[PDB]
Design a protein around this ligand. Structure first.
Ligand SMILES: CC(C)c1ccccc1-c1ccc(O[C@H](Cc2ccccc2)C(=O)O)cc1
Lengths: 268, 268
């Protein structure tokens, strides 16, 4: 019944708001510099980076970089910390997906393990525009250009994310839509090492119906949006890989830099 | 309109039947399926290959294993031959899809160029079962066991297609279904280098509606099958990506020789 699919759609949207302090709506309100009720400080060079520590809460360093964790590492660590924030956040959203917590404890861990970064980049697109990405809860805005100019390695960590987000955002999706799509991603079952696949696919079968109806209702004039969105799941998978291998490179060229256990545990 | 979507399906099916010798319906009668009226020649071991490869309808080389060319290599190059045949079959099919030829020729070459590998592994799965793959227009059956028993490079060449195949076949799709899915794969839109993505996506949109109608009417009880088929695309891409990987590795085994020139040329 439709009435049941809409109720689940309302449910998930609801938990989505409660689990993510920064929705796409808040994000676009800040990005479209019309809503000047609170604008972001912009980082596009080293000076701004320093000055950034001023206006925004940057526990990081302000002055010298190189001989004291150069700019590149500093941002990378900063980015590392947020990812941990997001996982914890995403993990809280997951518990609310009907049926998820009733699965084998092991699978729960496996679903999170593979689905988390795929989710981080999906939601990360909400904080991006062709020119940049929001940081520190919207208060800041770091330039894509400044990012694409960091030290040899770190210099190409976000580019594949921007490329994904610009075309993904062109789908004009909203929080209520993403809420369901985010859940569909978690309850895969095609995930490596699962014990009970049928119970997982039964949940996702629901999420997909929910999403199909939600997209029809929310975007009547958008033919086949449902399918276009599912295919986007390939671009996601590909991004994770580019990243994971990229991560492997730093680890070797930076034996002094560390990887937060929670993020380290996910990668494998 | 459903009428128009029922026409496009039958059209593609008709083209499909005439472009591909071995149909899934046929191949299935031969495989695990009984339908015994001419049992294929089973290659399960080295001698089986040797002792058949001399009676089987294979055109390229013969059983000569004794410091006279390696077996693994002869088998690998054999797939290349068949894949190159397959590529011509697909092209012949691509041309029957409404709108395809009306596209920028450069874009057609780009679409076939990148859609071909995914189409091959998809269709390969029709000739596969959990224990082996039909060979030579269906006159043979090379076991999965023998394939993983191969040397060192070549021992993991086909294993991932088997893992993909077994899950893919779990969907129980038939030639009428595969005919539309295949078309959808060719009419992507995200292939690198395209020049005019719009028409390509318009046709895919039209092809997607067809696959959706087809699956609903053809598999009424199989819920959300459409969504599940579309996510098999991630699996394909990974297969494809991971394949070019061994390809580069193999490129570090056999190479510099003067009797290969005009042969190496047929397969870039
Ligand atoms: C917005 C964030 C998720 C992000 C994504 C992709 C690339 C970089 C970042 C990023 C986020 C915050 C950054 O600066 C600090 C990071 C930080 C936050 C809290 C404690 C320690 C560091 C901040 O904005 O608060 C720098 C980069």
């Amino acid at each position: 019944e439709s009435a049941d699919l809409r109720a689940l759609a309302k449910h998930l949207y609801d938990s989505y708001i409660k689990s993510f302090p920064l929705t796409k709506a808040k994000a676009r309100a800040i990005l479209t510099g019309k809503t000047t009720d609170k604008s972001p400080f912009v980082i596009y060079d080293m000076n701004s980076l320093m000055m950034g520590e001023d206006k925004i809460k940057f526990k990081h360093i302000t002055p010298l970089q190189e001989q004291s964790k150069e700019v590149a590492i500093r941002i990378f660590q900063g980015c590392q910390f947020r990812s941990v924030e997001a996982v914890q956040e995403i993990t809280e959203y997951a518990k609310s997906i009907p049926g998820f917590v009733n699965l084998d404890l092991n699978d729960q861990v496996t679903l999170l393990k593979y689905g988390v970064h795929e989710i981080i980049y999906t939601m990360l697109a909400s904080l991006m525009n062709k020119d940049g990405v929001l940081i520190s809860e919207g208060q800041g805005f770091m330039t894509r250009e400044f990012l694409k100019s960091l030290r040899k390695p770190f210099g190409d960590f976000m580019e594949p994310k921007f490329e994904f987000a610009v075309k993904f955002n062109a789908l004009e999706l909203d929080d209520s839509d993403l809420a369901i799509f985010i859940a569909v991603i978690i309850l895969s079952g095609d995930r490596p090492g699962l014990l009970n696949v049928k119970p997982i696919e039964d949940i996702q079968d629901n999420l997909l119906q929910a999403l199909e109806l939600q997209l029809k209702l929310n975007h009547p004039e958008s033919s086949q949006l449902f399918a276009k969105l599912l295919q986007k799941m390939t671009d996601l998978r590909q991004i994770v890989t580019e990243h994971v291998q990229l991560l492997q490179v730093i680890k070797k060229t930076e034996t002094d830099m560390s990887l937060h256990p929670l993020l380290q545990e996910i990668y494998k």
